[model samples]
Target: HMQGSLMLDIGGTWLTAEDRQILRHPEVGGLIIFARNIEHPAQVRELCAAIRAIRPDLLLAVDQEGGRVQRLRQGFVRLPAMRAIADNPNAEELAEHCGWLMATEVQAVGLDLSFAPVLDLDHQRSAVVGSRAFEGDPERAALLAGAFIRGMHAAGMAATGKHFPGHGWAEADSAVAIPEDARSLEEIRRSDLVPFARLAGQLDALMPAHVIYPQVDPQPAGFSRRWLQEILRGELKFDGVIFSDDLSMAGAHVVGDAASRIEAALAAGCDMGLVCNDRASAELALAALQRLKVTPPSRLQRMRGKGYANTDYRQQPRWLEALSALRAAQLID
Candidate 1:
């Protein structure tokens, strides 16, 4: 039976005992922090240290993509938006530099991985993914996403390229609405999947989109064997960990109940299912996984040493300057 647990993503506020109890479960793998979990950088570090003390092997992650999606900004550096990185005329070098800078910042703060360099080729309809996407063109997104992955490596953390097979172009957030990417399979492969193809080698993990691509399959990409196995693994050649988007999401809910959803996700090749915020659902899903006896392999192993390792970002002149600028800009306190 499966022993490890789902990694958590919390707001900036500190964790409660209930939260701790949940995280401490043998099944839990890690934590993901958001703006709600953050009070200050020092506090964030302390919290991470505490979690690490509890389980040294636990992975800590964040959606620190910079720009609009950035979570760990206050008392830290306020990163430019992804578009800022993408829009930089020197797209290649600038993108790489941004990635390196982001990784360095994220690592210095005790996080393990950053779900970043959003790979979706931007389109007009997406409200949730706007400005979060690197650029409108898939090739450019791939180039920038690859740079970010390299940057994560440079900073000694693993990187997760997210919302796979593309999540951009959705008219609404999948958490609140049902959205479909109407693109054909051919269009997705040549365009949307281009970035996944470009950065598959560098990626340590991939989070498939919650949105359904009707042309490709009836199920969401996260729970579709046709997408995860046939396309992502066999066709695109992605050997990294597959993290499903939140199972509570509206798009993900299309399949059915919690048990069935978990079953479908696992059967479809997802290595992990995220049942964020819904304790009852998470518990049920965990039980289902245990019943199935699925075990996830070690992911982002290189990142394990990073959360506590010595880093010079705090002492580095540029980083310090950035930190100060961020504080001055009201991006951090």
Candidate 2:
């Protein structure tokens, strides 16, 4: 009965009394940690400890995709953007090293997952997905992101690939506006779908884009069973957890309200629906799930943070070499 199909967020660096109450709800399964909730590593530990004290199995996540997306910055390696690393001579190895470093820090802090290794094929047209994508080509993106996944696995953490099917072509900012991709499915399949299709088996989870493919479906991929069920699950055979992008986004408004968005996302085959930065939506979503009697599945067991011990891993030559190469290339801070 531990299934929490709703993933939401908290207000500050630590949990307040209201936060504790919110977490106690049965439908509340996991959390999406934000930069606003961060101060330092020790603070994260305390924050993590408090949450575990209530529900030990909650999935803790952050967008530590390196470059512009990384949330934990002060004590961690100042990782370059995926595009910055792509230009390096030893890009694959560096990608793997960055992944290892990212997951290692994530594990050390007692957090579960970092939603990373964006599979979007950057077209430079979308300002929202530019530098964060690994490459502009499908095969190359999969290869590099695949390497990053391997590094995360090596560090005992599961990888969650982001903005699947591809958001790089959707030029409008999905956070504020619903970006629509007009390219034919055939054209999309050749470019953006390459990374996810190629690395489907290797990825442990996927976050769908809110952008709509008009010809393909009326709803965005996040709320379309055709994309989530037909394409990802049925055709591509992706069996991992499918997380809905934040329901609070303007793009998700295609569905009616907060509760309707959650219902629509779940109906579309999302294992969990996320509602962030919307307190009214948060309370409403919890009620909606409770009314529906939702639970987190055992598949979520795969997303738990693989615990780690403090080690002097900084001494490793490969780690040092990755830095030296990036420093020589002036790609990192």
Candidate 3:
């Protein structure tokens, strides 16, 4: 199978027979895990091993962005919110440590990547992105996020800067509400896009936002070719992989059905379309994608993590040092 486009999710910690069947599908290129799929470190390692057993080249990812969005938590470090670190006097140093801690622990479990270091600015209007963003200032957010990305890269994991074109300013959460960014193109170019534009070359992957910029396009940024191709790729010169935000979100429904949304996203220049939290929708989207050509392997390869998987991560000196540093920083108990 040419595995290079769709990224789906499985139910529970263990893969069922049906889940195995879905994994075998040619259109399925990646897997994004959730809290429901995690239990303990040993179990997660085994799960990832099983996934690799099925498709060694598949991209295994998770939304382990720390704070409120971390998927694997119990055995992992209880990382403070991005805002908390930003508020600290030594924000840059703490953010880097937090990134290293997140990436090291996540990779130790045999998973490949985590959708991290949210690039969105905290405009105070967005409920979903309030504390999840580093700080309200674009330059500050870029500097902190750049440090965080460097930490992730140092840990041999790839960094994915997300909610592109920015998700701040908008009050409605795209997961449930269809939010509109009424800002003009020039206004957005000046503000929310600074972090993304500044760090475009450093990012391994980018996930476009579901929020619509009315002045730019009628379709949401994820579904807008104007945003992905013209703005992000053409203007910003981001050559990395472009992964669309979850198609299951309410914001994506504006395009049409699950199948239509997947097609639209791919057409908009996304290297991969994520269909998560709904198996039926995933199936429909998978079937829909069979009609289109798979994305080139070179593009998809950027999403893969670097280095070998370490099952005995607890014994590593670097891991212990990171834990101690987090404790000393008062980020963990």
Candidate 4:
């Protein structure tokens, strides 16, 4: 059976028999984890092992973006926010080290990918993307983001650049409000789109934002062919996988129902449609996908993690050095 194009989420740390059934569906290709799905390091490892046992080829992902967005914490090293890290004198090198440390730790637990390196320029408008963004300057953002991606590659983990085209300019959080970007396409291309365009070839995957750019299209970037296809794939020349931000977000509600949202996202240009949080909506999307003929793209395979999963990561000299650097930068306590 082929992997499905939908990436779903489980309820908790342990999978229920129902979860196994949902996972076994031919329309399910990946699983995303949140804080609710994580308990501790050992439990997370076992959880990932159980998931792999069920479907070894299924892509396992988590937010793990560090600072406020980190899902797997407590036992994990405390990572500084991107904005804080950007303030350092040795920003590029420190950002790369942070990327390596995050990727290495995530892979050591058997997780495949971490949606990271928020490419949005810190415009100081979007509260959701404030500290998550590297800096206010596009050039610096691109430089630091590239360094982070290189570090992730060094650790055998693929990097996913998120809220593509940029989310830092939107004041309203798409998860809560229907954020609108009224800026002209030229303005956006000049500022927010710089980082994405500069590092497009380096990214393994790109996640579009739910924020609507009315000047460009009425539909949000995730559902707009103009944004995802014409601009991202055609103009920006990003050949990587396109993952839709969670359809469960408030912003996605504008696209009618759950199944319609998934359909719109996939039809637009997204390789995978994420249906998270609500199980009923997720099942609706799965059933909708099952009725249709869909195939997973080859680019999705690049997201799989490549590393020694059973290794004692802490004992590795490289990991130790990276950890020490983070500590020296006051990123870790």
Q: Which numbered prediction scores highest in TM-score against the true structure?
A: 4
Model 2 local distance difference test score: 0.86
Q: Stretches of candidate 3 above 4 Å error?
A: 1-4, 295-297, 311-317
Q: How close to the true structure is residue 69 of candidate 3, measured as C-alpha lDDT?
A: 85
Candidate 1 regions exceeding 4 Å error are 1-5, 9-12, 300-311, 317-333
Mind giving the per-residue lDDT tens digits that candidate 4 earns over 1-333?
333399999887899999998998867889999989888888989999999888998899999878788987977887788988898889888888899888988888889899988999888889788889989999998999899899899988999999878998989989988999999999999999999999998999999999999999999999999999999999999998998999999889889899999989988989899999999999999988888767777778889988777667778888878878888889888
CA RMSD per model (angstroms): 3.3, 1.9, 1.8, 1.5
What would the per-residue lDDT of candidate 1 be over residues 149-179, giving only the tens digit for each residue?
7766766767788888888766778888888
Off by over 4 Å in 2: 1-4, 309-329
lDDT of 1 at 65: 77
lDDT of 3 at 153: 90
The candidate scoring highest on lDDT is: 4
TM-score each candidate.
0.88, 0.95, 0.96, 0.97
Overlapping backbone residue pairs in candidate 3 total 0
Clashes of 4: 1
Candidate 3, residues 37-146, lDDT tens digits: the string is 99998899899989888988888998898788888888878888888788777778777888877888888888889999899999899988978999999999999999
- Evaluated at residue 61, the lDDT of candidate 1 is 77
